[PDB]
Design a binder for this molecule. Structure first.
Ligand SMILES: Nc1ncnc2c1ncn2[C@@H]1O[C@H](COP(=O)(O)OP(=O)(O)O)[C@@H](O)[C@H]1O
Ligand SMILES: Nc1ncnc2c1ncn2[C@@H]1O[C@H](COP(=O)(O)OP(=O)(O)O)[C@@H](O)[C@H]1O
Ligand SMILES: Nc1ncnc2c1ncn2[C@@H]1O[C@H](COP(=O)(O)OP(=O)(O)O)[C@@H](O)[C@H]1O
Lengths: 28, 426, 442, 443, 111, 436
């Protein structure tokens, strides 16, 4: 069986998000 | 079908050969036919265990520098650690030296002379020497006139750490040279830039010469802490050297605050972002292999460090249609290490000591390791250690109807000497 | 780039049977020296004999450096060729043995074979998450093609390579895993969002087809000295460029020798031996010659090419006088290629080849005059006069350089012997060796 | 296939059991008394009880002193250290010459140690810090404890580290889901790679993937190591390896060779003596080869006669090429072999003798077989005549070019025409000196 | 904007570490700069990227003269280095000036 | 003793002198030179008196007459707790320090201060350690049962002891020594509970002790010079210590001696081959002995009327005249046959198994003929070739074999003289080829 993906602990962080239509920025 | 392959001695095998060939007076005992004749026997088994492979008689452990320490060891719901590595060299000082030279005392004059030489007569003092401070304020364009007194009375590492990003006055004589303007104009610059690509050749040499995937070639042999200083009967010395070895500004500057902690002060405790103790100033190493001096034992180095296992894994890469057997009496019943080798990396359907019936129903599971009428196996690899072909023929008698012979040899070792006498006997 | 004194030599001018052609590959003359140099070149190309000292001897203006540079040209790319001079050893930060050892380690090369992986596709979505101070970074990159789409994780170096030369969703980039390079091929989606900051929009490319992950194997060459300095300190990669490497211990030398032999036997590394060329080797010291005669006896030592233009001269640092300035123990190790002076036809061929490389249309009688000048004075003077005569012809607006330009150039600029006679005629005007002069006309 | 380095034909001294020398063994031809004396010296090394014994291999060029030194190293074995040297090595622009000499002296002396290290390793399932109480105060760290979950086969433990350990943990960029390796001796930690329990086909950082480590955590592993005494000195003088700011800052600086004080050497000797008496150390004294000892000046010899008379100093062997010459660093002392008379009383002279024609011929034959070129008999005799006439070395170096000319001539055989062409293309020292003499261009 | 630089400016810019701001570069900025032996590799990479942007057609290279006065006073090893530094590809013209006549070269005995 | 192999001066365990300084003919490994040995005994009693400051003695004589043996005998008979520094003439030419600075450091390494300090120490065996680690907050508590042969007690432990015992993990049965002032525990070992090992400590826990500390003035100078820590004492980058901190340390040492909490112990500085020092070094030594804090300097030279380095004239003993004026000279003589026999007897007795008497006579004849040191070097190789013959004793024929193999100086010089063109001369001329 295909192994699970690695856990993605991103708590405590700002976020840059760039998408097809528009780019975001989540900050604190 | 009979085939023979001869192999060259690998580097670690040859150095093990030489270091255990030296002794005091070996007189080349194993190739003096001591194995044919019947201490000599201990040298014979030592030469055999060396001449096959190193890890069949001692484990290739981790590669680490020698820890020159005296740390807290044991004799063997959480177990905790405190860093307690110390050098074995203990420099012992009398208490009179410290308490009469370093610390202030009523009969000592350390603090008085310290202030008198560092504050009362410092030439950057604005209370006494204004015009000199105003002179340098005109020169360097400093916003504050106490900054020269601050720079003159600060340790170098501490003064390096609290680096100020504030721009200077614009009427200064500090005229920024063209190299600084070149460096600042490319500080955050894209690719395909004419001034951008001129000023980074180390990143071009990095990407061109593939330095991101190179391996560590050198590790130090001995690593040590700083030599401990042991003054008896005072806690001030303990506090002082514990503060100097672990200064929280210097230690925190070579550090990084965890991300959820930065959440905690920035949001939960409301600490402003610029008032964080600064981190991340430790230099980045060249690669992930260059981070630490400890080298893990690699599986691929086990594969490649043997004269015979390298050509053996080459052969089972080539041989798929015929199940094969190994005479494990080349090392006198050593099943263990080849077992770890071929279920660690070269994993296959396998059987090793109802047992004889499992490999005849299908050839997908090979007969593999057995110690020597079961000729139903497709082939058998019986290769060397035969100074007598009688056990060779009795092993191949046990063994489909077709029998195939795979012979292995190492040149320069005892196999050439027993396997040139037994070659004419065949 | 620019035309230099050795612009014309492209090879050793040598046939496949190790016999020199009369005029080929930008070379003429010195047939026995060319054959011996080709033999040394074939020795290097075999690459199984280490530490063979080769010495070149001859008068000045004979073609010693031309022979060595022709060896370097015909030697082929990606095989090292150091071209040090004798004076560069004497340093204030290294020892002379240390400088010789570093030149030796520079001359020997390793061809590392590395397995890499190439991905190329249309970028879907970036999810860079950074800490508050920005020090620690982790992200997720999403990339697709016409066939399939994959979600990859991100590290520190890949995120900082995405930030610099900034990549938006809608771009087609190519990433090499082993080197960590980022190559934005262009913008494919042409998204409707147009921020007023972006003024440099990359050219449109068709979004790629096929599988993203393509297996690739590449080879790169790194010399022994570079690996030595890389493993020497924590920041060793800077010391290649700043040159602040120095007095490197023998421990890293022996450990890297063992590791290099390890990479050799597992098939990662294929050592190519190189050539160290020491022009004007008579400039060196006796300690350097001692280290040289004891340094060729290792497996990691290249073919050493040495040049001199001295007769029986004083060996430096010593009272005695030795052939070629080199002591007898070193001279016994070396094998000597000799060179002999030219004649009128070879000199004529030299200036014809030079003027072809100097883009000068020279007339035949001016060529004859230049050959007579070159035989009369030196080859280098008649080589140097061609560009000056070309400039003089350019000032008179004639393309072909004629005899009067050659005579005007000869009158304007002085060679060695005429300058010697002009000094000897009125020596009181120049400052004497005893520091005596007369600066007044009366 | 394998590169020849002018000494690959030499495998050992070639002696028999009783100390007599076979005429052909180990690539040695002749030099019987020299080989017997060097075998006696090898036996003296394997005795491992003497200190500061010195020999000088007197002789001319093309004789075999360097060959005898590497023969000693081959016979002794790679376990006992061998430190080759040239006399020009002792002049350094960064430190005194005498300190370079003693650094080579303690490079020669070896050590055999066996050490047990407390080792923590396993897969990081949990990694949660604990925040400090007053973070902006700055007189403490920003954290107080870090709880680390380590999982391996057969055992699983939770780890409450000090912040100073977490410094190295964050410096190796340890994330959740990789196999790590904490060495509790020094506090160093090595991040092996990402664990293969998860998917391994989606990273972009060419990471290596490792299985779960076998055995429990808190493995106590005993390893065996071979170090020199100089390496202990250079580790204690420049203290890299601790987790204090002195050690972390000492990693980053460019190292300079410093004058290592004697007090450090006595402290290292005391620690090593405690390791001897405790039972994990065994001393392995070695051999140091100073080739070209004529190049050393009077100061090194004057310090050498005192440095050889210490309790720990190894056996040094010396080579000299010159006869009755003046000592460097002085202008009046005329002394044999460039060695002052003060040192020569400590010294045991081993003479080496020049060669005959048959010895030269057999040396050429063995050197041709080692370089894998077969020769013809008349060409070998011609090369023997040139070796007697010019030098042995010139006949040795000419072997490869006639081989090159033979492959040029589409044959594997060396004939006398190839030898004559090697004569015509390349020249020895004597013909070059005569060519310099006849010419007036200062050729 | 047209900016004019020398090749030594590019070499000394690439040699000192730009960016990073991680202890070592900041200590290098605060301490006194040290003249260091710039290796051939740095100069070769600089010449490579400069030739690349010359072949692009956006950069223009212009050699300038170098005037060494009192050239009678250089040591012999400087002349020995200059013999092959003059033969290099990118090195410009150099103008030499001497007033002495029949004299011994500094650094040697009787030349 | 540290790690010590057999060396040249290993048999010398001190001066073989009686109570009235009269030398015994053979005692403590040393034989002969009775006038020189009596002089060295008088100098030893000077140093042991410690009331005389800054005298220089010059041990001059022929090579291989025991001058270094005399100095090693003085150093061995001095014992420990008195500083001794043996340097050579080539050490002080430093690439970082000046010559006078290195001489000042070597002068101040041989002057020592003796301080008596009384500390506190608790050392026993741990019967049982318990911790009530119910950490509701940062506080924790625990109790410790520590035992000796005459003690058995329980302690209530504060928080800092719990922190100090969490690291250096003490189990039950381990032997620990606790410093209460600094809170540093040392794990000496584990007691006899096998079912590294150390004996269980004796009674009277919490016993004060006096550890007598002797430090040199160079270490105090390095410490008081503020920008160099004590790591300069190991790294060697002390780097030109200023004169004012030296003056401060001298005044503080005089204050400590007067007020009686420190005692000054003079030592001996030995300079082997003093003839290689420059005239500047001779001037600094010439004016350096007038300081009160100056040791007793020993100088050994074996040169005749030779040049002084840094000058061009010749002077007796290789030393200038004023330095010869400021030093008393100990003379040493050569050895006759019986002294050579006794020395070879002692060295062969210690170094290896016994010799046959005719072989010892052949050694004595060779030592008279060529050199003492050559025969002493022949001893070991003759024994090794005896082991290769598989015989216990060393016979005459083993000595004959070793004499055939290993040449002395005279045979090497002579054999160089008959074979001259084979070697390289001063002019670099050598005939490598053997034909014509
Ligand atoms: N065989 C040749 N082919 C091409 N050019 C040559 C040849 N021989 C000499 N030259 C020219 O002669 C000049 C001197 O040669 P070079 O070896 O550089 O200096 P030198 O001979 O003084 O050492 C060079 O400029 C070179 O171009
Ligand atoms: N006894 C010997 N047997 C075989 N070859 C020798 C012998 N002695 C010297 N040689 C060869 O002669 C060359 C010179 O040896 P080396 O000792 O390095 O120089 P030298 O003999 O001048 O001291 C070496 O290449 C070696 O192969
Ligand atoms: N009186 C003596 N007693 C014992 N051994 C001696 C005596 N004199 C000399 N020796 C020995 O002779 C050897 C060389 O003497 P050395 O001390 O070098 O003489 P010097 O100091 O005069 O050069 C040393 O090993 C030393 O032990």
């Amino acid at each position: 069986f295909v192994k699970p993906r690695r856990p993605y602990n991103s708590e405590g962080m700002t976020r840059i998000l760039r998408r097809y239509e528009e780019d975001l920025f989540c900050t604190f | 079908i009979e085939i023979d392959v001869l192999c060259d001695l690998t580097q670690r095998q040859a150095k093990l050969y030489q270091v255990l060939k030296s002794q005091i007076s070996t007189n080349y005992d194993a190739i003096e036919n001591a194995a044919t004749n019947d201490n000599l026997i201990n040298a014979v088994m030592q030469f055999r265990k060396v001449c096959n492979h190193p890890d069949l008689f001692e484990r290739a452990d981790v590669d680490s520098p020698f820890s020159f320490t005296t740390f807290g060891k044991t004799t063997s719901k959480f177990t905790d650690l405190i860093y307690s590595s110390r050098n074995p060299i203990k420099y012992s000082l009398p208490r009179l030296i410290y308490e009469d030279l370093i610390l202030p005392n009523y009969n000592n004059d350390v603090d008085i002379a310290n202030k008198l030489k560092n504050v009362k007569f410092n030439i950057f003092n604005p209370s006494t020497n204004y015009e000199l401070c105003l002179f340098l304020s005109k020169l360097t364009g400093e916003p504050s006139l106490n900054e020269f007194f601050r720079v003159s009375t600060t340790p170098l590492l501490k003064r390096v750490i609290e680096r100020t990003n504030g721009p200077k006055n614009t009427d200064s004589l500090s005229f920024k040279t063209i190299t600084q303007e070149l460096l600042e104009v490319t500080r955050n610059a894209p690719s395909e830039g004419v001034m951008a690509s001129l000023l980074n050749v180390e990143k071009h040499a990095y990407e061109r010469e593939y330095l991101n995937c190179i391996q560590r070639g050198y590790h130090p042999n001995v690593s040590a802490p700083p030599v401990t200083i042991e003054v008896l009967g005072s806690s001030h010395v303990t506090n002082s050297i514990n503060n100097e070895l672990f200064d929280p500004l210097i230690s925190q500057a070579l550090s990084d605050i965890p991300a959820i902690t930065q959440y905690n002060m920035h949001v939960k405790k409301g600490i402003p972002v610029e008032d964080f103790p600064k981190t991340g100033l430790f230099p980045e190493p060249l690669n992930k292999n260059f981070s630490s001096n400890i080298s893990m034992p690699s599986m691929d180095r086990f594969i490649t460090e043997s004269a015979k296992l390298r050509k053996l894994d080459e052969l089972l890469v080539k041989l798929k249609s015929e199940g094969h057997r190994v005479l494990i009496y080349f090392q006198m019943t050593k099943m263990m290490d080849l077992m770890e080798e071929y279920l660690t990396y070269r994993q296959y359907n396998h059987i090793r000591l109802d047992l004889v019936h499992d490999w005849q129903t299908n050839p997908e599971i090979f007969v593999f390791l057995l110690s020597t009428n079961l000729t139903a196996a497709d082939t058998v690899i019986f290769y060397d250690s035969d100074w007598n072909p009688t056990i060779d023929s009795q092993a191949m008698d046990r063994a489909t109807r077709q029998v195939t012979v795979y012979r292995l040899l190492v040149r320069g070792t005892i196999e050439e000497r027993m396997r040139d006498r037994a070659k004419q006997k065949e | 780039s620019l035309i230099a004194a050795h612009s014309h030599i492209t090879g050793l001018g040598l046939d496949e049977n190790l016999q020199p052609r009369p005029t080929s590959e930008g070379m003429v003359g010195q047939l026995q020296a060319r054959r011996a140099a080709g033999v040394i070149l074939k020795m290097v190309q075999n690459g199984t004999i280490a530490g063979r000292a080769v010495l070149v001897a001859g008068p000045p203006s004979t073609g010693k450096t031309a022979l060595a540079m022709g060896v370097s040209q015909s030697l082929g790319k990606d095989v090292p060729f150091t071209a040090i001079a004798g004076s560069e050893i004497f340093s204030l930060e290294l020892s002379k043995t240390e400088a010789l050892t570093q030149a030796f380690r520079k001359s020997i090369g390793i061809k590392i074979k590395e397995e890499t992986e190439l991905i190329e596709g249309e970028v879907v979505e970036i999810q860079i998450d950074r800490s508050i101070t920005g020090g620690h970074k982790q992200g997720k990159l999403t990339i697709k093609t016409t066939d399939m789409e994959t979600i990859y994780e991100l590290g520190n170096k890949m995120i900082d390579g995405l930030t610099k030369e900034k990549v938006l969703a809608g771009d087609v980039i190519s990433i090499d895993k082993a080197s960590g390079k980022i190559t934005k091929l262009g913008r494919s989606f042409a998204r409707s969002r147009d921020y007023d900051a972006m003024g440099a929009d990359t050219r449109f490319v068709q979004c790629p087809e096929g599988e993203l992950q393509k297996r690739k194997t590449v080879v790169h060459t790194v010399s022994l000295h570079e690996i030595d300095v890389i493993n020497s300190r924590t920041q060793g990669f800077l010391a290649l460029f700043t040159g602040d490497t120095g007095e490197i211990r023998s421990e890293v030398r022996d450990q890297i020798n063992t590791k290099v032999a390890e990479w050799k036997e597992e098939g990662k590394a294929e050592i190519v031996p190189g050539v160290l060329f020491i022009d004007e080797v008579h400039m060196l010291d006796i300690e350097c010659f001692s280290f040289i005669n004891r340094a060729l006896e290792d497996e990691f030592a290249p073919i050493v090419m040495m040049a001199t233009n001295r007769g029986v001269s004083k060996t430096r640092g010593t009272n005695y006088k030795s052939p070629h300035g080199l002591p007898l123990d070193l001279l016994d190790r070396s094998i000597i290629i000799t060179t002999k002076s030219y004649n009128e036809q070879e000199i004529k061929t030299i200036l014809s080849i030079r003027a072809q490389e100097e883009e000068v249309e020279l007339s035949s009688d001016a060529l004859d005059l230049l050959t007579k000048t070159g035989v009369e004075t030196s080859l280098r003077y008649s080589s140097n006069l061609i560009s000056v005569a070309q400039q003089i012809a350019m000032k008179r607006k004639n393309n072909t350089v004629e005899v009067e330009d050659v005579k005007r150039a000869y009158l304007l600029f002085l060679d060695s012997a005429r300058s010697v006679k002009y000094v000897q005629e009125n020596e009181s005007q120049y400052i004497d060796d005893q520091g005596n002069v007369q600066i007044s006309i009366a | 296939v394998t590169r020849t380095a002018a000494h690959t034909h030499i495998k050992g001294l070639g002696l028999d059991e009783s100390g007599v020398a076979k005429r052909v063994e180990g690539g040695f031809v002749g030099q019987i008394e020299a080989r017997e004396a060097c075998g006696v010296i090898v036996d003296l090394i394997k005795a491992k009880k003497m200190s500061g014994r010195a020999i000088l291999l007197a002789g001319g060029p093309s004789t075999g002193k360097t060959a005898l030194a590497l023969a000693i190293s081959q016979e002794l074995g790679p376990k006992v250290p061998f430190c080759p040297l040239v006399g020009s090595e002792l002049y350094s622009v960064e430190v005194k010459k005498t300190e370079t000499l003693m650094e080579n002296f303690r490079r020669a002396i070896g050590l055999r140690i066996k050490e047990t290290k407390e080792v923590y390793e396993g897969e990081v399932t949990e990694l949660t810090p604990e925040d400090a109480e007053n973070p902006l105060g700055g007189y403490g760290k920003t954290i107080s404890h870090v709880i680390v979950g380590l999982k391996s086969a057969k055992g699983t433990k939770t780890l409450r580290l000090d912040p100073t350990i977490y410094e190295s943990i964050q410096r190796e960029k340890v994330s959740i889901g990789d196999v790590i390796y904490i060495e509790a001796n020094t506090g160093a930690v090595k991040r092996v790679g990402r664990s293969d329990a998860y998917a391994t086909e989606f990273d972009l950082e060419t990471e290596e993937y490792v299985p779960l480590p076998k055995g429990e955590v808190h493995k106590k592993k005993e390893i065996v190591q071979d170090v020199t005494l100089h390496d202990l000195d250079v580790a204690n003088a420049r203290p890299q390896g601790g987790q204090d700011v002195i050690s972390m800052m000492g990693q980053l600086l460019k190292p300079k060779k410093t004058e290592i004080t004697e007090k450090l050497r006595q402290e290292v000797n005391k620690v090593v003596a405690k390791y001897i008496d405790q039972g994990v150390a065994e001393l392995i004294p070695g051999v140091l080869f100073i080739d070209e000892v004529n190049m050393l000046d009077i100061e090194i010899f004057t310090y050498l006669n005192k440095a050889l008379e210490s309790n720990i100093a190894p056996v040094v062997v010396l080579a000299s090429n010159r006869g009755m010459t003046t000592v460097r660093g002085t202008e009046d002392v005329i002394s044999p072999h460039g060695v002052p008379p003060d040192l020569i009383d400590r010294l045991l002279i081993v003479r080496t003798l020049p060669y005959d024609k048959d010895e030269i011929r057999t040396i050429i034959e063995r050197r041709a077989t080692v370089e894998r070129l077969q020769v013809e008999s008349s060409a070998l005799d011609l090369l023997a005549t040139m070796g007697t006439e010019t030098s042995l070395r010139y006949a040795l170096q000419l072997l490869a070019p006639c081989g090159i000319l033979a492959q040029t001539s589409n044959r594997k055989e060396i004939v006398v025409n190839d030898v004559n062409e090697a004569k015509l293309l390349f020249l020895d020292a004597k013909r070059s000196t005569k060519i310099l003499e006849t010419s007036a261009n200062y050729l």
